Amino acid sequence: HMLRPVETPTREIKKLDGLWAFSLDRENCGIDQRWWESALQESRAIAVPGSFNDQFADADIRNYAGNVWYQREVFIPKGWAGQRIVLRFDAVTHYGKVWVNNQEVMEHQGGYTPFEADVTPYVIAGKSVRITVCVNNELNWQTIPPGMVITDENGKKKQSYFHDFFNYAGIHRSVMLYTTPNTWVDDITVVTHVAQDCNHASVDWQVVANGDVSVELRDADQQVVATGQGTSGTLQVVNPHLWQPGEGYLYELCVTAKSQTECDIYPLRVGIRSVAVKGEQFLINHKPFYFTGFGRHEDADLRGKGFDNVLMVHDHALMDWIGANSYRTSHYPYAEEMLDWADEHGIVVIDETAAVGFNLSLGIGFEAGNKPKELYSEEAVNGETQQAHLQAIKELIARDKNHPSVVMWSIANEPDTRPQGAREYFAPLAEATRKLDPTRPITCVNVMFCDAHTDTISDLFDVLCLNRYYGWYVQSGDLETAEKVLEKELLAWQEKLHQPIIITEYGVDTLAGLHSMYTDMWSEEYQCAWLDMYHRVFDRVSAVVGEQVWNFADFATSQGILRVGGNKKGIFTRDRKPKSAAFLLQKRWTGMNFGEKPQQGG
Amino acid sequence: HMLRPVETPTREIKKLDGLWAFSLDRENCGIDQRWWESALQESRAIAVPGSFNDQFADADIRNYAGNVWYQREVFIPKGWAGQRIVLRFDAVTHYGKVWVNNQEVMEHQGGYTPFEADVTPYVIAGKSVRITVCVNNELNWQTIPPGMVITDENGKKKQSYFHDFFNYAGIHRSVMLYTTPNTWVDDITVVTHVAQDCNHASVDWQVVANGDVSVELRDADQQVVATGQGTSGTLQVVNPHLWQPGEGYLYELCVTAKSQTECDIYPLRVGIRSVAVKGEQFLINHKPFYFTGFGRHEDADLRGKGFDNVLMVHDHALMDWIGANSYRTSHYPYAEEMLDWADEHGIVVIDETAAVGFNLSLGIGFNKPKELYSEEAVNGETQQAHLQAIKELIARDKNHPSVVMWSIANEPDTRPQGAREYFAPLAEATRKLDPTRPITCVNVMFCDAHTDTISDLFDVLCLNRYYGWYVQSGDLETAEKVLEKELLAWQEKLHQPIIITEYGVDTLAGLHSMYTDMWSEEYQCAWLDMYHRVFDRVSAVVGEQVWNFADFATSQGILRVGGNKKGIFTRDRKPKSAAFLLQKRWTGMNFGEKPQQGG
Numbered sequence A: 001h002m003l004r005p006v007e008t009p010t011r012e013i014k015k016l017d018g019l020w021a022f023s024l025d026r027e028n029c030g031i032d033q034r035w036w037e038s039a040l041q042e043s044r045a046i047a048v049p050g051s052f053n054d055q056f057a058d059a060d061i062r063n064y065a066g067n068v069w070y071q072r073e074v075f076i077p078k079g080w081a082g083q084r085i086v087l088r089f090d091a092v093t094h095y096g097k098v099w100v101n102n103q104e105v106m107e108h109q110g111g112y113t114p115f116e117a118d119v120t121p122y123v124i125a126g127k128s129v130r131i132t133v134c135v136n137n138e139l140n141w142q143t144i145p146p147g148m149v150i151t152d153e154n155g156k157k158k159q160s161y162f163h164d165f166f167n168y169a170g171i172h173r174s175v176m177l178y179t180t181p182n183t184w185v186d187d188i189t190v191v192t193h194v195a196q197d198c199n200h201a202s203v204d205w206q207v208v209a210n211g212d213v214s215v216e217l218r219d220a221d222q223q224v225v226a227t228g229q230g231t232s233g234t235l236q237v238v239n240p241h242l243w244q245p246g247e248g249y250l251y252e253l254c255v256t257a258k259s260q261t262e263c264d265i266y267p268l269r270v271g272i273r274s275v276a277v278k279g280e281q282f283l284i285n286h287k288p289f290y291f292t293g294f295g296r297h298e299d300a301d302l303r304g305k306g307f308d309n310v311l312m313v314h315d316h317a318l319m320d321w322i323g324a325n326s327y328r329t330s331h332y333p334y335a336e337e338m339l340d341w342a343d344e345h346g347i348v349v350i351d352e353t354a355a356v357g358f359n360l361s362l363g364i365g366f367e368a369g370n371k372p373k374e375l376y377s378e379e380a381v382n383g384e385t386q387q388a389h390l391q392a393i394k395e396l397i398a399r400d401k402n403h404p405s406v407v408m409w410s411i412a413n414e415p416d417t418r419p420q421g422a423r424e425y426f427a428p429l430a431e432a433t434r435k436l437d438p439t440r441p442i443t444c445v446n447v448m449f450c451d452a453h454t455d456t457i458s459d460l461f462d463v464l465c466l467n468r469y470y471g472w473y474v475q476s477g478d479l480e481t482a483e484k485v486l487e488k489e490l491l492a493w494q495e496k497l498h499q500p501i502i503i504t505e506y507g508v509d510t511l512a513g514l515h516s517m518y519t520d521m522w523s524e525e526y527q528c529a530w531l532d533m534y535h536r537v538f539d540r541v542s543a544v545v546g547e548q549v550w551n552f553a554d555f556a557t558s559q560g561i562l563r564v565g566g567n568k569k570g571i572f573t574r575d576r577k578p579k580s581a582a583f584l585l586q587k588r589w590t591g592m593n594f595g596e597k598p599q600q601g602g
Numbered sequence B: 001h002m003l004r005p006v007e008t009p010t011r012e013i014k015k016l017d018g019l020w021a022f023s024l025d026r027e028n029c030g031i032d033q034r035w036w037e038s039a040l041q042e043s044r045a046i047a048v049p050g051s052f053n054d055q056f057a058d059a060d061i062r063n064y065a066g067n068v069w070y071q072r073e074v075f076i077p078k079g080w081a082g083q084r085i086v087l088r089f090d091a092v093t094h095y096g097k098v099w100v101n102n103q104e105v106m107e108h109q110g111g112y113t114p115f116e117a118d119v120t121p122y123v124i125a126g127k128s129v130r131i132t133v134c135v136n137n138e139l140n141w142q143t144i145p146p147g148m149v150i151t152d153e154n155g156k157k158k159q160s161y162f163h164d165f166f167n168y169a170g171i172h173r174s175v176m177l178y179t180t181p182n183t184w185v186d187d188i189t190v191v192t193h194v195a196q197d198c199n200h201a202s203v204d205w206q207v208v209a210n211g212d213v214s215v216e217l218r219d220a221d222q223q224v225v226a227t228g229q230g231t232s233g234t235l236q237v238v239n240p241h242l243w244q245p246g247e248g249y250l251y252e253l254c255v256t257a258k259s260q261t262e263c264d265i266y267p268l269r270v271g272i273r274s275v276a277v278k279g280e281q282f283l284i285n286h287k288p289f290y291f292t293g294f295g296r297h298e299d300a301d302l303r304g305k306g307f308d309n310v311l312m313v314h315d316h317a318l319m320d321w322i323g324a325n326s327y328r329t330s331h332y333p334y335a336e337e338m339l340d341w342a343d344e345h346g347i348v349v350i351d352e353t354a355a356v357g358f359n360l361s362l363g364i365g366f367n368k369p370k371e372l373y374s375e376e377a378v379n380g381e382t383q384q385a386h387l388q389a390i391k392e393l394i395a396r397d398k399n400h401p402s403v404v405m406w407s408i409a410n411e412p413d414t415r416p417q418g419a420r421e422y423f424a425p426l427a428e429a430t431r432k433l434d435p436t437r438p439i440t441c442v443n444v445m446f447c448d449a450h451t452d453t454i455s456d457l458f459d460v461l462c463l464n465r466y467y468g469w470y471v472q473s474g475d476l477e478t479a480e481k482v483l484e485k486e487l488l489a490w491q492e493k494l495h496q497p498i499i500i501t502e503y504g505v506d507t508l509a510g511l512h513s514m515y516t517d518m519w520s521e522e523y524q525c526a527w528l529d530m531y532h533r534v535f536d537r538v539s540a541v542v543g544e545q546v547w548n549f550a551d552f553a554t555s556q557g558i559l560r561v562g563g564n565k566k567g568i569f570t571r572d573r574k575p576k577s578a579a580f581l582l583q584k585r586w587t588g589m590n591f592g593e594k595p596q597q598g599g
């Protein structure tokens, strides 16, 4: 049960104050000598939210593998006497264990979705309470994402993994204590059905803990348009203002939880909108839609994957300027602020789990050992990797279920689907995801070397999501040969599956400032030509309903002879400065009419 | 047999000067309709010397594979009535064939050595004469370097190859027309022996066609120090000025060709010095020398591999500043002007053939064959092309005091058997053709001491290691333990001198990092210094040459950010902050003397 904390006859004390106490544990005795009992020794100040790696400008904290210790004191408000108090961490990256004055209250593995615990019986209103958090940043074959922790002869651990972004860790989003009455709405689910844009039914179901419920649906003018009663089985009839790409009109669903003595009211934002895959078209409110935009990353210069409000306002200014209407939460669930923003401004979003790197055939990642000889086996990606993967799909859906901006679930990104057993693994989670949320189409993002003749699992999903790099990793430099290989591949995919096709990753590494008269790899002129050749192919294949440039911005990776200080396929630099290709995309995406496929002309 | 032209009663008109007419031949019909009979149709101005690839800022010229046509007119000087006249191309890269007004005079395969021809019966002094050159840049398995032309499904050629530098082609060095009397010295060989630097001997052997000759030795003051005579070679011995890596003193041996009617005088520069490998030591006139310097490339911005005097003077100023006393002519024979400069200033040179890319296990260059040494690919025909490359490299550079060692090939894969069947005869024929200098073969990283098969056949051990870059990436401390364990494993196996001819890490100028991580200028500094503190504790190491004096152009790949970035300087010769590191080390050292495990 997961709900976004809101402030309506409910209160929150943001504990994000940053400047927590921070300590590493190289001897791995913090669990032994009970570090949560007293003030951290030889600690230093750390900002929260924020990864711990880049904050101190020291490589040995940056590449540390093990447990980190955060600690903070906080005075708990007097006026929260008869109230229930909840300690919430919206993301502790990988593993987190918390102590409230020598008492463990919570424990979570999963670095990108929130976890909380009821803290009332160990908190006194008016007294200062000390909060110790043990965070772990290791990945094994049953974590999501997977990885291999490699011990040397002296016990120093080096993390190897198989995905192309740096494994930033720490407390990445907002830590809060919030209240609630002892009768409280604990979960809301809303489904919206659309019938040619004139009258529609909003199935409601609510799991209040301790009260009867009435619901009331208010519009943007806060006028009541519909009322309902009952723990569930609320379905309200409207003459509506649809949630549309571009505007994002949001109704408001006020859920009342009234007991004999107390009362609780929760406002949930509701977008009225239907998503459906019919033929080779991805229909939003029964109209064919064309995706434009980006694969993104939660990546910045000194906060790592730390959330930040200026960074979110500025990147949406840029995505609005360049003409993008969509993005994919590339490789992990994002902060909820991001999806709340998409809800307000009508931005279409593909939501993605953290299941990246189910593939040991890429030079991508960190290679500090020897990879297993078979990916789908008891040693690697086993039945428990599958249960961890299921668990990650349920937590992801459990948080973003009612966001109207989410149009698709991405179960995984570029798994290797050649070995038999890839389907033994992915088929159960594809049907289990459809049983978790049957209102949104389902996808898995397909790697380049699993061509249409070789891929084994793509028929289990609704939309085909492709990542292609013809002319970069293969046919390097040869635009005219690449155009032929790409058009042949895309027509083969369409003929075999007859699904809609979104290209979720296409891009080339580009040094900002490197220019060439020969349109060479790594030059800004190559990026431009390469993107425009891809665009001429898309416009000639009817089944293509989306284009998402691989990254919006340069981002940090682990060290390797393929990664010049990070991955450089961004349209913008890491400090958000535009490369030449940014004006290429702006002319395309603002020259098309909104949400519709270019008819191969202009 | 070949000599570099000079000028005391021998003449020269360098047709190098300026613009020739240039045209591609995408239809391969130049030979068919015999383009040498008329002026090139639809030509354009090209500069010689210079690669044709980068001169036009056209991608379709730059990546061209096939035939290209140079053409030029020239007035034959009138004072040349009774002289015999030679047309000399000092380099036409890969293949050239020459016409001198509808008469074909010469043709050469091998893109880095000179080739000439007598042109007298086809010129008469005082008239304009047309020169057409058909240049080819295709590599196959029987060329040095080898390559693989793959033709598409219908029509176009694309050239694949296995070395890590761009395949620049065209007329890269000087084109000259020179005269000579009809009795003339054709070739001169000089070998010099020293014992304890007090009074020593110049064994002479020379071929003068067309007459009996005086041979006379003058010193830097034009003072005659010994005269001796014959027609073929006999020895000379007086009290000398040794050619030393510090100074570079050059005596001069004049050869005066006496015939009945005519006479011809050739001035040859002679540096009197010995070279010998003894135990683990590289001795120059019997004192151990310690090499410092660079693997270099002939690579400038708009000219490709075209020679250029300003670029030569500037790069030598920079190597002089940084303190390097040596360098290796990485992966092809260099311009002779470099080796004459090395003569004058006493720079020690490791000279090398174009035998690069005898390895299909790298991810550099460019359906490749299964086994390196077989009939498909490297066969008996490649072995003779390889030997021929050695023949004309040695025949070109035998008289240079600065050429201290020959390198027969660069990073060949010596794991498949047949590598020794291939390389044993090459080593012995090379010793047969010049036994005055040691010979080596530079060894790849993945063929460490317990894998390599042909280290025995050479006098010094040449190593190219990149621990911390291509393996244990970023890990300076584990790279240190691999690097030093190997350096001692090699010395126990062979007790050879060990010159590290390649070590470097790609580094983008401007990229700085508080973490000492790859691609940053800081990583380049720390990595180099760690390799240095490993060198100084291994007794058998005789030289260090960091991989590359300057960023250079390669073929396009995901491993090459707009070229190879392992340079100490950038392509325009600006110093990355590691240049100050090496100048600290190479100038704090005593000259040519190893650091004694410290400072």
Ligand SMILES: O=C(O)[C@H]1CNC[C@@H](O)[C@@H]1O
Pocket (backbone or CB within 6 Å): A163, A164, A165, A364, A414, A467, A505, A567, A569
């Ligand atoms: O290699 C790349 O640039 C991309 C290839 N596909 C997966 C991404 O995580 C990765 O960033």
Ligand SMILES: O=C(O)[C@H]1CNC[C@@H](O)[C@@H]1O
Pocket (backbone or CB within 6 Å): B164, B364, B411, B464, B502, B547, B564, B566
């Ligand atoms: O990979 C590299 O940078 C070097 C490795 N050894 C041989 C060089 O030609 C090459 O350039």
